Design a protein around this ligand. Structure first.
Ligand SMILES: O=[N+]([O-])c1ccc2nn[nH]c2c1
Length: 299
């Protein structure tokens, strides 16, 4: 049974997965994505180090492969991350002039979003912008541009492709009492009050065992910021307990504005955390107990 087909029948948009060319051409990834998933994100091929390895000079081959495969197979596309501290080339990190970094960041956003204009359902525009205490993370953008970098990124993105849903995403938003969870909500409210076009908050749910239960309180807290959408991103759970995975899926079902769920990969050996067996398919590409538990929960 297809978890994407089932979640759509419950009124959600998709069950998605991160992938890229050389997963699509190996294992049983393409077959499983075709049957069971409704949306794909490039895991790496849209990040800054992959797409703009030197200033103004873009590399599209990998991202084009993913986008084309998705279109050929009738899948929605999410992509990102346009602005975050991960996967950031040293040429960007070196920049000290505010105007220069604003131009660099806007060129990066506009070039990527223009190439794929109208093809991308969801763009993760800003990622990992918060410290664990809820203050803004002192990455190169904050240090050089200041906190306006976030409004500028979103306004630039909206102009480049008005059709895309624009998200901010972060991790450790899994507990409703944690300061980071509270802070992203409070700041997204403020930005949206200033007219900043933040359509979504995405929660990067890289979970430890037993953390599914807390998401039942954290996800509605995230939704209280008033964005039209929220999403679950990068989902994996150490041990892949059915209870953890079902709690996450039910949090999605409970939150009206939660459009869907993206898992970090298909099969355990292809996880960055393979020892923790944290995905829904095993190393022979067979569905695990958590996959079947989600099926039953959604039926
Ligand atoms: O949900 N995802 O797995 C995922 C993976 C990589 C990303 N880059 N930007 N947004 C992403 C979402």
């Amino acid at each position: 049974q297809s978890i994407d087909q089932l979640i759509k029948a419950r009124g959600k948009v998709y069950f998605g997965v991160a992938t890229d060319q050389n997963r699509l051409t190996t294992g049983k990834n393409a077959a499983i994505i075709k049957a069971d998933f409704g949306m794909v994100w490039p895991e790496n091929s849209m990040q800054w180090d992959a797409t703009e390895p030197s200033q103004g000079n873009f590399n599209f081959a990998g991202a084009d492969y993913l986008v084309n495969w998705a279109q050929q197979n009738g899948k929605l596309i999410g992509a990102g991350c346009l602005v975050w501290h991960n996967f950031l080339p040293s040429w960007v990190s070196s920049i000290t002039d505010k105007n220069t970094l604003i131009n660099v960041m806007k060129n990066h956003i506009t070039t990527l979003m223009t190439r794929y204009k109208g093809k991308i359902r969801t763009w993760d525009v800003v990622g990992e912008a918060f410290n664990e205490d809820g203050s803004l993370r002192q990455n190169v953008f904050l240090n050089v541009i200041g906190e306006d970098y976030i409004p500028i990124a979103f306004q630039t993105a909206r102009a480049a492709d008005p059709n895309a849903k624009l998200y901010i995403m972060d991790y450790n938003l899994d507990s409703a009492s944690y300061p980071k969870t509270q802070a992203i909500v409070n700041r997204v409210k403020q930005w949206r009050a200033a007219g900043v076009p933040i359509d979504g908050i995405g929660s990067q749910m890289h979970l430890s065992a037993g953390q599914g239960a807390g998401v039942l309180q954290a996800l509605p807290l995230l939704a209280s910021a008033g964005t039209p959408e929220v999403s679950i991103l990068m989902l994996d759970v150490a041990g892949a307990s059915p209870t953890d995975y079902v709690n996450v899926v039910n949090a999605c079902l409970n939150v009206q504005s939660c459009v869907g769920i993206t898992v970090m990969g298909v099969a355990d050996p292809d996880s960055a955390f393979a020892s923790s067996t944290p995905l829904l398919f095993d190393g022979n590409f067979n569905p695990k107990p958590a996959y079947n538990a989600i099926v039953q929960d959604l039926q």
